[PDB]
Amino acid sequence: QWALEDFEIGRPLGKGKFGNVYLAREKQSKFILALKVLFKAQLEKAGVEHQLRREVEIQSHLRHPNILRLYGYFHDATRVYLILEYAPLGTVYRELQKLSKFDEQRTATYITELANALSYCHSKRVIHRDIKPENLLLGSAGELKIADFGWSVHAPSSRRTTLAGTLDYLPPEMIEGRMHDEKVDLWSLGVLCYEFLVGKPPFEANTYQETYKRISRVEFTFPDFVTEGARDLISRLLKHNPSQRPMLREVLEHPWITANSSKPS
Ligand SMILES: Nc1ncnc2c1ncn2[C@@H]1O[C@H](COP(=O)(O)OP(=O)(O)O)[C@@H](O)[C@H]1O
Ligand SMILES: CCOc1ccc2nc(C)sc2c1
Ligand SMILES: [Cl-]
Ligand SMILES: [Cl-]
Numbered sequence: 001q002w003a004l005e006d007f008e009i010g011r012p013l014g015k016g017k018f019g020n021v022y023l024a025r026e027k028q029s030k031f032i033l034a035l036k037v038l039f040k041a042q043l044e045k046a047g048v049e050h051q052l053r054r055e056v057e058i059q060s061h062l063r064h065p066n067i068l069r070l071y072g073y074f075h076d077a078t079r080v081y082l083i084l085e086y087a088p089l090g091t092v093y094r095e096l097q098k099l100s101k102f103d104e105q106r107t108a109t110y111i112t113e114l115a116n117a118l119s120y121c122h123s124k125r126v127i128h129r130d131i132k133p134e135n136l137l138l139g140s141a142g143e144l145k146i147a148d149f150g151w152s153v154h155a156p157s158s159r160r161t162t163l164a165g166t167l168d169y170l171p172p173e174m175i176e177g178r179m180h181d182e183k184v185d186l187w188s189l190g191v192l193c194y195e196f197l198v199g200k201p202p203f204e205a206n207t208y209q210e211t212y213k214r215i216s217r218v219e220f221t222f223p224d225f226v227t228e229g230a231r232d233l234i235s236r237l238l239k240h241n242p243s244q245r246p247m248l249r250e251v252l253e254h255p256w257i258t259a260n261s262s263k264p265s
């Protein structure tokens with residue numbers, strides 16, 4: 001169906017390990033969108049064809065205001081192209097580096113949006129497993145949208161693919177290569193809440209080896225300015241035992257979230 005000839009390409013929107021993402025306009029409709037380009041040579045080398053198929057299959061059937069749309073895909077002799085909804089206000093990552101830290105109202109509102117999206121995903125037993133600021137995009141009204149479903153799967157699951165970069169958002173069961181389920185996304189939600197309020201993730205360190213250590217032992221502390229409500233929520237999410245982490249309804253109904261969020265469940 002779609003082919004490269006159908007689009008006018010514009011400015012680079014960002015880069016990933018495999019993804020190179022561009023603004024684009026479809027020629028006869030003038031529809032503005034984002035084109036995610038992947039190189040087949042690099043995909044075959046890393047052996048991650050199965051991850052891309054899951055990305056397309058999982059993300060194209062989800063429909064939620066806080067999840068980025070995937071409309072389709074095409075490919076030629078050297079490249080694969082994913083046709084995505086364009087997110088005009090950029091990444092939460094860029095926003096955090098602009099402001100250093102988020103206030104309590106901004107943080108709680110982002111957490112509500114994230115928990116709504118994740119609740120919808122978990123109702124289909126879909127787990128994202130790669131929730132982090134560079135994969136959270138912003139729509140035209142500043143609303144958060146989850147993107148980048150390359151690591152997503154159906155629970156329960158193991159891991160058959162090498163962990164590439166940062167350990168910072170992963171739970172103990174995941175980094176220890178053990179068995180895992182939906183509760184992994186709840187751990188990540190805790191890491192994000194901390195990073196939004198403080199400016200850095202709670203297990204950050206100078207080496208892989210030591211980050212692994214801080215995560216497996218759940219070794220984190222709070223700066224003085226983090227309030228008692230925020231501390232309570234984060235402490236509940238960052239539990240070593242997955243079955244002790246709260247359900248998402250409990251997150252959405254936590255007194256600190258209800259007091260500070262400007263959006264409903
Ligand atoms: N739909 C989009 N709208 C705007 N920017 C995007 C969009 N998709 C990706 N980006 C930008 O490109 C980067 C890489 O996209 P991503 O899909 O996460 O690739 P990878 O799978 O390589 O991580 C993002 O972190 C973001 O900066
Ligand atoms: C949903 C389609 O996924 C695809 C399609 C083509 C393709 N070519 C590769 C080398 S990896 C791959 C994945
Ligand atoms: Cl498996
Ligand atoms: Cl895997």
Ligand SMILES: [Cl-]
Pocket residue numbers: 119247248249250
């Ligand atoms: Cl729930």
Ligand SMILES: [Mg+2]
Pocket residue numbers: 016134135148
């Ligand atoms: Mg990404």
Ligand SMILES: [Mg+2]
Pocket residue numbers: 016019148149150151
């Ligand atoms: Mg990816």
